[PDB]
């Protein structure tokens, strides 16, 4: 019952992303990027709400949910500049997107029209999230070419 | 530094309790106790906010946080009735209280007045939380003596 | 009483900090850093308000206060750029913190519960104050790596 | 004066009632009947207000008031269900009614028209108070026949 | 244990003070000091509210409370002037302060952080209460040096 | 101008000195339970500090280098034992704030420093107001304090 397992794992993936955003928030705060830290913190809350959405839909559709361990974030070990963090967040969102497309591909195989309809807005959110992060990362990578300049973006924007 | 250690453990414990309250709402939902499930769901969010509060203080005080795995909730698999769930949630809160007091003990021994001040409203919150859950459990245990009657409590949320 | 002595020293320490913030405001103003000047000026009034809070408590609790001289700020003479100012201010705040922690320890030993309670919000204020000065100093030190760029933090504030 | 004496005893009886209501609040609360607890709590403040009213009238009328001890409520030692509590509260109000009629009898005897006029709203309050408490007791006694049912109306109601 | 006892005594002391304040309102009213009487009456209600706050906390923390007798006030038999009343009220509050501090000592000894946190605002209120009473008494004692002058305090504040 | 810069610096010192003397006075009044008088001195302390900040602000704009001096420990408190003594000391403080403004203005006139003279003018008028008001309070205090308790009644009302 691959579909029920993938749905279950999607919840884990959402909560996993929430923790990694939190991890990014903490690294930014510890290094005095309060603007970038606030953005990561909001995204952490948003990834948790996506998870809660999946759980609620599962409850309604009698998809048994069993909550799994939420793994320790580990990219924070290696981050040493804002660019490192944003790049890890971009990889996280790309993985998020692949996991949703797998889910929707299993639903399609099983003719599970309800699940596919449920997933639609999420596919469009991922498009927007990858673009947004991609854009932030491009800015960060450009600005960090001059010492101190990126520190101006955080504060202003 | 056992203080740093206990502070990290507290963050973990708050997120752990968040997940346990989510598993409770899941079980309540799946068994058609929507009122009780709404309540657990809001407590889940609240525990997460307590975790965030600790993280924020730790950042400001240069207590380095490293996010740990959030363990899977274990007790659901054994719950059979609402009484079982409210009992596990009472134990959870009793544990929550214990670890706040341990943390506070270690702060005291260190003369860390800032940490003690920070924890005061959580100590008072814990008193309230254990009271409220104790009270709910007593009602549940009294009302469940008549078949069907507890379902009536549940349509009071 | 050493408690009495320390309580009186704390008043002087708050007024001393007010003067030193004022000295910084002056140095910033004379050097055309109006945004940083305004910020230091507001911190000078706040420090004076803390002094006054201690004085008022002392009157109420029969701690005799005798006001001491407020020494001339000395660090201005050596400041050459905004980094030097902000680093002196961070030191000032670290010393404000230590003096409050010593007062609290003296209060603890005498079982002076009222003094300990009165001090709690100042312990938490200090945590915030050090985090905030720490974070400005980090930005200032990063942005001053490019000529003129820090002058852009000041105006955009 | 028997009147001065009864007037002072009236004050004591009110403050005693206030304490007994408070002990009922505490038993309810400790036993997780928060609605019944809130009711008793509000009744304790009301009884205190009746005592203060008597005190104020006494001062105006030059009846010297000497505040007496308010004894420890002791029935809580033996309460074990809400029914026991409300039974004790009914007895309490029947006693409040009796000390009021004693005071009024003595006032009538002495032709103290002012005192009797002062007492009239209290005589009507007691009527209402005894009626309300008796009705709550009848409800509690009927509901407690089915396990759990009483609890379900502490919550919904009070 | 010492904590449950002291906690019960504290409720007793608050209700006793409530009666003592009532007793003073009585004495003032009987002697045509309506202003001072109204003030004592408000204080009587306020002490009663403190007692109820302790009771509520004890309920929540499972500190069994059993209400003790409220003794007959007895200072009233000896009061001859406003000054004697206000002197008894000062001693009353100094005794209120004493017992709070003992309760706090005992809580500290047991590491009862919740009780200590609950007590902190009462410690600060006692400081204010003793100040205010000390100050009223100074005024009464000064003003009563000229016949009839104290009747002025009363009809104004 | 050298004596003009020095006097302008001393003027800053004088305002903050006065601010601390007024605070000393608030503390003495509070400790002796004159709350009304205490609140008035505290308000004055803040206002004196504001005047100082106004001088600092003008100095900065005019490029008069300000170096902040020690603010001395107030010492009149040691001597005060009634409200009269506190108010007299405050009158003499405002009389010295006045002399010191007039000195400054004298140096500026000499130097033809028109902007400084313009800047001082409202402070000259304020000092008139301040010496008049302290004078009036001190006369009231000294009159009232001839009857025991009387002064106390008017801290409390006014
Ligand atoms: Fe978003
Ligand atoms: Fe997501
Ligand atoms: Fe997003
Ligand atoms: Fe986003
Ligand atoms: Fe928690
Ligand atoms: Fe909790
Ligand atoms: Fe909760
Ligand atoms: Fe809550
Ligand atoms: Fe601030
Ligand atoms: Fe600040
Ligand atoms: Fe400070
Ligand atoms: Fe600050
Ligand atoms: Fe009633
Ligand atoms: Fe009623
Ligand atoms: Fe009623
Ligand atoms: Fe009554
Ligand atoms: Fe009654
Ligand atoms: Fe009070
Ligand atoms: Fe009060
Ligand atoms: Fe008061
Ligand atoms: Fe009290
Ligand atoms: Fe009191
Ligand atoms: Fe003035
Ligand atoms: Fe001035
Ligand atoms: Fe002046
Ligand atoms: Fe003035
Ligand atoms: Fe003025």
Residue numbers in the entry:
A (entry chain H), B (entry chain C), C (entry chain A), E (entry chain F): 2 to 158
D (entry chain B): 2 to 159
F (entry chain E): 1 to 158
Question: What's the publication's text?
Answer:
Ferritin from the marine pennate diatom Pseudo-nitzschia multiseries (PmFTN) plays a key role in sustaining growth in iron-limited ocean environments. Typically formed from 24 subunits arranged as a symmetric, hollow sphere, ferritins take up soluble Fe2+ and catalyze its oxidation, with the resulting Fe3+ being stored as an oxy-hydroxide mineral in its central cavity. The di-iron catalytic ferroxidase center of PmFTN (sites A and B) has a nearby third iron site (site C) in an arrangement typically observed in prokaryotic ferritins. Here we demonstrate that Glu-44, a site C ligand, and Glu-130, a residue that bridges iron bound at sites B and C, limit the rate of post-oxidation reorganization of iron coordination and the rate at which Fe3+ exits the ferroxidase center for storage within the mineral core.
Glu-130, a ligand that can coordinate iron at both site B and site C, was substituted with the non-coordinating residue alanine. Two structures were obtained from E130A PmFTN crystals soaked for 5 min (E130A Fe (5 min)) and overnight (E130A Fe (o.n.)) in aerobic Fe2+ solutions, respectively. In the E130A Fe (o.n.) structure, iron was found in binding sites A, B, and C. Iron occupancy at site A was 50–60%, whereas in site B, iron was observed in only six of eight subunits with an occupancy of 15–35%. Fe-C has an occupancy of 40–65%. The iron coordination spheres of Fe-A and Fe-C are as in the wild type protein, except for the absence of the Glu-130 side chain. As seen in the E44Q Fe (45 min) structure (data not shown), Asn-97 is coordinated to Fe-B in the E130A Fe (o.n.) structure. In addition to these sites, up to two iron ions with occupancies of 40–55% were found beyond site C toward the mineral core, as seen in wild type PmFTN. One iron ion is coordinated by Glu-47, and the other is coordinated by Glu-44 and solvent molecules. Substitution of the site B/C coordinating residue Glu-130 with alanine, a non-coordinating residue, led to a striking 10-fold increase in mineralization activity; this is unusual in that active site mutations rarely enhance activity.
